[PDB]
Design a protein around this motif. Structure first.
Motif, PDB file in Angstrom:
ATOM      1  N   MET A  21       0.882  -1.136   0.005  1.00 54.13           N
ATOM      2  CA  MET A  21      -0.026  -0.080  -0.111  1.00 54.13           C
ATOM      3  C   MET A  21       0.733   1.432   0.124  1.00 54.13           C
ATOM      4  N   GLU A  22       2.182   1.267   0.171  1.00 54.07           N
ATOM      5  CA  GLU A  22       2.966   2.375   0.232  1.00 54.07           C
ATOM      6  C   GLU A  22       3.298   2.685  -1.289  1.00 54.07           C
ATOM      7  N   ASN A  23       2.826   1.757  -2.167  1.00 58.75           N
ATOM      8  CA  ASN A  23       3.039   2.065  -3.581  1.00 58.75           C
ATOM      9  C   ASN A  23       1.846   2.994  -4.103  1.00 58.75           C
ATOM     10  N   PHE A  24       0.850   3.299  -3.438  1.00 56.71           N
ATOM     11  CA  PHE A  24      -0.209   4.165  -3.658  1.00 56.71           C
ATOM     12  C   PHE A  24       0.014   5.474  -2.818  1.00 56.71           C
ATOM     13  N   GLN A  25      -0.662   6.513  -3.515  1.00 54.61           N
ATOM     14  CA  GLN A  25      -0.796   7.864  -2.701  1.00 54.61           C
ATOM     15  C   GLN A  25      -2.174   8.268  -3.100  1.00 54.61           C
ATOM     16  N   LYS A  26      -3.036   8.261  -1.824  1.00 52.94           N
ATOM     17  CA  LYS A  26      -4.245   8.799  -1.934  1.00 52.94           C
ATOM     18  C   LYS A  26      -4.638  10.190  -2.333  1.00 52.94           C
ATOM     19  N   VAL A  27      -5.487  10.394  -3.326  1.00 53.26           N
ATOM     20  CA  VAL A  27      -5.688  11.929  -3.677  1.00 53.26           C
ATOM     21  C   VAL A  27      -6.930  12.065  -2.931  1.00 53.26           C
ATOM     22  N   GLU A  28      -8.057  11.317  -2.904  1.00 50.79           N
ATOM     23  CA  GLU A  28      -9.284  12.097  -2.222  1.00 50.79           C
ATOM     24  C   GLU A  28     -10.111  10.774  -2.088  1.00 50.79           C
ATOM     25  N   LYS A  29     -10.967  10.820  -1.086  1.00 53.64           N
ATOM     26  CA  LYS A  29     -12.087   9.860  -0.841  1.00 53.64           C
ATOM     27  C   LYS A  29     -13.045   9.960  -1.886  1.00 53.64           C
ATOM     28  N   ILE A  30     -13.453   8.783  -2.529  1.00 56.18           N
ATOM     29  CA  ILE A  30     -14.699   9.073  -3.648  1.00 56.18           C
ATOM     30  C   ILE A  30     -15.950   8.297  -3.349  1.00 56.18           C
ATOM     31  N   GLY A  31     -15.923   7.418  -2.412  1.00 59.78           N
ATOM     32  CA  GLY A  31     -16.988   6.648  -1.793  1.00 59.78           C
ATOM     33  C   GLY A  31     -17.034   5.694  -0.986  1.00 59.78           C
ATOM     34  N   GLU A  32     -17.986   5.256  -0.542  1.00 57.10           N
ATOM     35  CA  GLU A  32     -18.105   4.106   0.616  1.00 57.10           C
ATOM     36  C   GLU A  32     -19.383   3.262   0.599  1.00 57.10           C
ATOM     37  N   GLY A  33     -19.301   1.752   0.609  1.00 59.33           N
ATOM     38  CA  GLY A  33     -20.399   0.973   0.572  1.00 59.33           C
ATOM     39  C   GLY A  33     -20.148  -0.224   1.416  1.00 59.33           C
ATOM     40  N   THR A  34     -21.329  -1.069   1.179  1.00 61.61           N
ATOM     41  CA  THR A  34     -21.372  -2.216   2.195  1.00 61.61           C
ATOM     42  C   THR A  34     -19.851  -2.944   2.103  1.00 61.61           C
ATOM     43  N   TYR A  35     -19.158  -3.219   0.961  1.00 59.00           N
ATOM     44  CA  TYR A  35     -17.952  -3.984   0.715  1.00 59.00           C
ATOM     45  C   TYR A  35     -16.650  -3.030   1.046  1.00 59.00           C
ATOM     46  N   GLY A  36     -16.841  -1.508   1.108  1.00 62.50           N
ATOM     47  CA  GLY A  36     -15.460  -0.857   1.466  1.00 62.50           C
ATOM     48  C   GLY A  36     -15.495   0.624   1.042  1.00 62.50           C
ATOM     49  N   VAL A  37     -14.319   1.252   1.286  1.00 59.73           N
ATOM     50  CA  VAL A  37     -14.086   2.795   1.160  1.00 59.73           C
ATOM     51  C   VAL A  37     -13.288   2.693  -0.463  1.00 59.73           C
ATOM     52  N   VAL A  38     -13.508   3.585  -1.012  1.00 62.21           N
ATOM     53  CA  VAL A  38     -12.866   3.857  -2.384  1.00 62.21           C
ATOM     54  C   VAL A  38     -12.208   5.124  -2.354  1.00 62.21           C
ATOM     55  N   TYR A  39     -11.241   5.207  -2.967  1.00 56.39           N
ATOM     56  CA  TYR A  39     -10.226   6.538  -3.103  1.00 56.39           C
ATOM     57  C   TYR A  39      -9.806   6.710  -4.436  1.00 56.39           C
ATOM     58  N   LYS A  40      -9.639   8.003  -4.769  1.00 54.91           N
ATOM     59  CA  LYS A  40      -8.975   7.921  -6.019  1.00 54.91           C
ATOM     60  C   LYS A  40      -7.597   8.154  -5.707  1.00 54.91           C
ATOM     61  N   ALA A  41      -6.548   7.547  -6.332  1.00 54.83           N
ATOM     62  CA  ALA A  41      -5.150   7.136  -5.739  1.00 54.83           C
ATOM     63  C   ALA A  41      -4.272   7.234  -7.039  1.00 54.83           C
ATOM     64  N   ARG A  42      -2.993   7.560  -6.627  1.00 55.02           N
ATOM     65  CA  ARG A  42      -1.813   7.467  -7.846  1.00 55.02           C
ATOM     66  C   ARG A  42      -0.981   6.460  -7.275  1.00 55.02           C
ATOM     67  N   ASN A  43      -0.748   5.504  -8.435  1.00 52.41           N
ATOM     68  CA  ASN A  43       0.058   4.205  -8.482  1.00 52.41           C
ATOM     69  C   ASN A  43       1.546   4.769  -8.506  1.00 52.41           C
ATOM     70  N   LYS A  44       2.262   4.711  -7.412  1.00 51.51           N
ATOM     71  CA  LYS A  44       3.850   5.288  -7.562  1.00 51.51           C
ATOM     72  C   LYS A  44       4.530   4.514  -8.337  1.00 51.51           C
ATOM     73  N   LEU A  45       4.340   3.500  -8.640  1.00 54.59           N
ATOM     74  CA  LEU A  45       5.174   2.583  -9.565  1.00 54.59           C
ATOM     75  C   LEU A  45       4.927   3.042 -10.908  1.00 54.59           C
ATOM     76  N   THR A  46       3.939   3.094 -11.505  1.00 55.40           N
ATOM     77  CA  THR A  46       3.507   3.463 -12.865  1.00 55.40           C
ATOM     78  C   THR A  46       3.077   4.579 -13.155  1.00 55.40           C
ATOM     79  N   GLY A  47       2.656   5.460 -12.037  1.00 54.41           N
ATOM     80  CA  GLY A  47       2.193   7.027 -12.443  1.00 54.41           C
ATOM     81  C   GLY A  47       0.556   6.832 -12.753  1.00 54.41           C
ATOM     82  N   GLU A  48      -0.165   5.822 -12.790  1.00 57.08           N
ATOM     83  CA  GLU A  48      -1.541   5.685 -13.244  1.00 57.08           C
ATOM     84  C   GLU A  48      -2.351   6.224 -12.178  1.00 57.08           C
TER      85      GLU A  48
END
Ligand SMILES: NS(=O)(=O)c1ccc(N/N=C2\C(=O)Nc3ccc(C(=O)O)cc32)cc1
Ligand SMILES: NS(=O)(=O)c1ccc(N/N=C2\C(=O)Nc3ccc(C(=O)O)cc32)cc1
Length: 293
Positions: free
Chosen positions: A1-28
């Motif tokens: 998880m240190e490979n992702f930088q969280k940008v902002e929280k975008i959602g939450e539901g029964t199965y979890g919390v969703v964040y917009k994030a940047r993949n530190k390895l690929t820049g995606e």
């Protein structure tokens, strides 16, 4: 998880919390979903099957990260959901050709899921994602029944019942792919009219709102309904209202298709494959939405 930088929280539901994030390895830029729980072995195997359920109208599951007894799903990122787009389009309405395109595409995605015996189970405008090219994709499914325990509401959750099929509300635990067609019908009606079709805030309010519009179901229209687990003979018997009030000013082809997507008997309810052949789609196109990002 240190490979992702969280940008902002975008959602939450029964199965979890969703964040917009940047993949530190690929820049995606991705959607990183932290699954709410270590994690059971059946959940890992079931989620691994979702990596092979690939289609243009299903949000791409890029990677499953099961490390330090936590589970993260990395998905492709889309910039807006249908709930926000509906709200943005409230004054003018979404143009019919775009409604038709979105409905057609979601039926294509469901026909694919369903052919692989995968049910969405909780379709709603918040888990339908759109992009600038005119695509719409299914998200937030595939994790139900994989954790092996009864569903319990998470802290701060308010469940949305508006799109739930009547067989679920009546206590069927072994329901079919038809539940997704019902939910998509409810969303179709909402896109057309700019109002939720059945906005219940309790299970009985949801059920009675359906009954007041479509009529209280009986053995004539839904053989076996009276033997459903939560069916009560004491339900009030509302007459079916004339359907002309349901989705004005939609044409007869759209009204006909919606009536087949909202049949009470799940066995009579149209399948995604049959719905794709309905005359309402003879003039389908793929327009560009005006998205304000
Ligand atoms: N499929 S895609 O979304 O178009 C995409 C875009 C960018 C990338 N970059 N990958 C990498 C990048 O830039 N530095 C890297 C360093 C290491 C690795 C690796 O595999 O070990 C990959 C990348 C990938 C896909
Ligand atoms: N409200 S909004 O600003 O229009 C919005 C909402 C949602 C998004 N993206 N969500 C997701 C995305 O990009 N990939 C996903 C994959 C899975 C899930 C899920 O819930 O399981 C959610 C998303 C963007 C803007």
């Amino acid at each position: 998880m240190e490979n992702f930088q969280k940008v902002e929280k975008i959602g939450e539901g029964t199965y979890g919390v969703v964040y917009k994030a940047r993949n530190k390895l690929t820049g995606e830029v991705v959607a990183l979903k932290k699954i709410r729980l270590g994690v059971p072995s059946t959940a890992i195997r079931e989620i691994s099957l979702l990596k092979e359920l690939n289609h243009p109208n299903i949000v791409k599951l890029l990677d499953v990260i099961h490390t330090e007894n936590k589970l993260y799903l990395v998905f492709e990122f889309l910039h807006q959901d249908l709930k926000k787009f509906m709200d943005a389009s409230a004054l003018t309405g979404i143009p019919l050709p775009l409604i038709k395109s979105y409905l057609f595409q979601l039926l294509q995605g469901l026909a694919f899921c369903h052919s692989h015996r995968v049910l969405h189970r909780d379709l709603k405008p918040q888990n339908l994602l759109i992009n600038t090219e005119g695509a719409i994709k299914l998200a937030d499914f595939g994790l139900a029944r994989a954790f092996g325990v009864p569903v319990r509401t998470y802290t701060h959750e308010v469940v949305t019942l508006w799109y739930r099929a009547p067989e679920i509300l009546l206590g069927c635990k072994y329901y079919s792919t038809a539940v997704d067609i019902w939910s998509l019908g409810c969303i179709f009606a909402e896109m057309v009219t700019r109002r939720a079709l059945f906005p219940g805030d309790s299970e009985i309010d949801q059920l009675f709102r359906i009954f007041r519009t479509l009529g209280t179901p009986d053995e004539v229209v839904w053989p076996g309904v009276t033997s459903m687990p939560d069916y009560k003979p004491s339900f009030p018997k509302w007459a079916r209202q004339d359907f002309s009030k349901v989705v004005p000013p939609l044409d007869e082809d759209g009204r006909s298709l919606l009536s087949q997507m909202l049949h009470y008997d799940p066995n009579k309810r149209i399948s995604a494959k049959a719905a794709l052949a309905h005359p309402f789609f003879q003039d389908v196109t793929k327009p560009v939405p005006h998205l304000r990002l």
